[PDB]
Symmetry: C2
Subunit: 546 residues, 2 copies
Amino acid sequence: SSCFPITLKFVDVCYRTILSGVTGMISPGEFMAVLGPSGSGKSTLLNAVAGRLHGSNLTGKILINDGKITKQTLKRTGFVAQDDLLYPHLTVRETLVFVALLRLPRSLTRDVKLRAAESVISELGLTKCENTVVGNTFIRGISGGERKRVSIAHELLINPSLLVLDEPTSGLDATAALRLVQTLAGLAHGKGKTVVTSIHQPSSRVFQMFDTVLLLSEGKCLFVGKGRDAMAYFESVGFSPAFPMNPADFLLDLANGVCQVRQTLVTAYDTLLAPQVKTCIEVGGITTCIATWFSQLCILLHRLLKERRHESFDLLRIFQVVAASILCGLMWWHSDYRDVHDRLGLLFFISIFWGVLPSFNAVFTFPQERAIFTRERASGMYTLSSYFMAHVLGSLSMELVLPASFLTFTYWMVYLRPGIVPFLLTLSVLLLYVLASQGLGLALGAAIMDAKKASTIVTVTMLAFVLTGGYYVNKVPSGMVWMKYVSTTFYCYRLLVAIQYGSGEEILREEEVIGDVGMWTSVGVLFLMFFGYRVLAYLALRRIKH
Amino acid sequence: SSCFPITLKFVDVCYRTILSGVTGMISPGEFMAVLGPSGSGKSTLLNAVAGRLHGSNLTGKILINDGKITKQTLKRTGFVAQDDLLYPHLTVRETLVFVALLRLPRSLTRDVKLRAAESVISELGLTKCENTVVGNTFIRGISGGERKRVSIAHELLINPSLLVLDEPTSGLDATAALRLVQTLAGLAHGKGKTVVTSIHQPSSRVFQMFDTVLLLSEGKCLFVGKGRDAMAYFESVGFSPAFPMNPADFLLDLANGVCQVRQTLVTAYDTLLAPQVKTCIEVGGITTCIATWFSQLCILLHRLLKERRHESFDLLRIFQVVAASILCGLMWWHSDYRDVHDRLGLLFFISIFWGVLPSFNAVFTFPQERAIFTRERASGMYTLSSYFMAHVLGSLSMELVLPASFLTFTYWMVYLRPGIVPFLLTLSVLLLYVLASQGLGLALGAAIMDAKKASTIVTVTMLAFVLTGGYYVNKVPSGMVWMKYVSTTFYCYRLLVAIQYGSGEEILREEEVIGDVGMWTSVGVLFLMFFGYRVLAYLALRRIKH
């Protein structure tokens, strides 16, 4: 792999000071480690050499193969970050299949996009756990050193020629962190890539696997050399250990003061190594762009299918609906339609329960997956308009199966109106109201992007929708009668009474409670709240500038 | 300190195998490290040598100063565990003052119990942050290496002569984990104590601070010696490194296979070191016991005072009560008492809101602090009956200030009955109902001890209390009329109507809604649910056998 070499030179990097004159070169086929104490800015060097600091404070010359950070050579570079962002309910094989269908170019087949995702599984040693779910801290999945190899496989699908990693071995074991360094040395030696990593606290034989070492001590680097003459260099200045110790622990003490002194390391670097490195340092149309959109939406629906039915079918949401079905069928068992005060309280309990329950569970959707979206939209996998519509279409399928089972169990126990026409009109109003209540939660969760702070604002909003719905207060004090024309509970409840009683005179053989609004101007407003709360959630997610 | 030495011998420990013949002795004034791979059972050795495995599977001779694990010599032993259990809202000084008032003996003054808690602060180096709050991951407090010194200070108040620690330096920094080992070597050398610790992955100069080393490789130990002749012993068998490396990394490779082989280490141990260690291995009344109880309750009230007002006065619970006060004063503004259907809906909204809101927030109390309670009750600081009554008395003070401010703002806006006698009877019924609704949440949170699983059972229970309360369903189908005699919402709502309308005939100048239950048999049942739900929470916490 990678028969197209690369050479990375970063002459005089200065970031504002964090970095103050870092200079070195990275030949193709080398495995380099950036060593430094926690604060020297060894994470800032990796981002500003992979093209993540966009020339604002970065005053240096990051030139890639005697060039620049032009986008033609930036698609040959992968940056593996420090935290892992994976979906739990996908297995290891189908994690890397949906990523290969989104990242690899559109002018291929589906044949060599599945053989490009199984040549990456059986190269990082993931062929044992490929049918095991990924999981998280709450789902029994895969181990944390084998969870890191899925993040590295996510970057090797596009076949990069420069791989930049940010603390791979961190939290891993003693022997899991050695086999990971042994494959990263197998990429740089066997394939011919160029790996630049930053190891925090290496070990006695992890330091033997390295090839070149960079030592940062708050800005100015102290040593750039081939990783086994590091201990023979500092004894020429006059620094040497006493007790037998790790060669990586002797260097990380010279980086912060403790010797066996910090200022003479900086002066001796600019007189013997910096003259040595800097002499060598110069020598489709319209039909294409629509079918690309619908394929981004069909992959993102199947990729998120297992996540949506984890939200809407756990056993603590089924138990709240089975309980409310039994308590309604036992309180209003074989109810009579001639006592109007009881049946109007049945029809208002349905409006409270199915407006509070869809709106509350919808404010957790977008703040839960924000780091996953902003990492993957910035990497060119998908846009916002196809990510968003895969949540709109995928949530109006799973959220319409518990209210449809509530009503079937309950409709002929409590003796509502008999017939197939009053039953299918009562189900249609109930499912339109669940979709209008859900979009109010999606609009408040996206505008605020905090799940605990928006959970109390949907409480206060839905408390005012119930009180102005038309059941508790029979006469409203004349500066509050405007308030019922914005609530979803008012328009649902006037439609349920119009189906069960009609115009009103059929029971007259209690008139302000069977009053007049209109049956076509109540379904017309529940569609304006269906479409209108989904548009205000798109515009609230458009504001997040990456 | 510790002018009463101790000598720990643990001849032939075998635990069922985890441990299979561990044998050694620990002289007074030594700092010993137990080294081993993750799985060798170096945590099981520390618990079974501090007296935490109670002779069931532990088939060995744990003898302490040629004795046994009799309770007279077990109060001279401190075991610092691995995770830290601290209250966040207490500062560092008053954390160690409440612990000193509970652990030190009762036959002292309060003078030398505060000078015994400030000679521990200015000995572990906590005199800089003594006025800084402890915090957690969510509150900005103190650093995680300085959070560990508060756990060690918790065990040095009783002045032990054997201190046993379980991975102290874990998650700490490179230089924070060196200064912690330097004070633990200052206890064993300067004072004269006996420190036995188990370090996971030590460093190059952390290994120089040790004095004796124990090396466990799955059961049978491989080396017991004075920590600087460890590398000169294995080269006499014929094992030696090649590249320069940490002496703790060479040993932890011989413990699992990897050499520069595992079975010849076990045989060579039982022929040269085991004959060497085993030749030396033999040569008040009634007024006292009540005032002790009331002092445990006065300390535990002030210790938990800052935690109770974090629960009941955050800005997301104040915003739900200010919103409901405004929505009630605007919907029923200057209401009239002659339209009875509106005022009965005002009095039923108060019963729903103040039964759902106290019961929901009470199921989080006991599962939140279970590891703190079971650690500290087992250590002899307090019992269950004084820990429990400090939550009962401390929660009926802070939970009666938001419903008392709700009613004062609202009572003369919505024009309920004028006078000081109908106002103080309406406040008294509302505060008795809040205390009865709270105990139902405490009983369900303690029986289940899971905050998410009990949060849906208080939902289903309080949904059935509302529907059988007496407002929605006017006639109940004759097998469900028993169900209203167990709900708290029924007994509160019949008392509010009896204060605002009375016997009923005063408005008769709508009779099943101003019916008959009794005003003394409704306050008598709200006290039986006050006391009865608190007794069922004590019996549900009594079942947890440590």
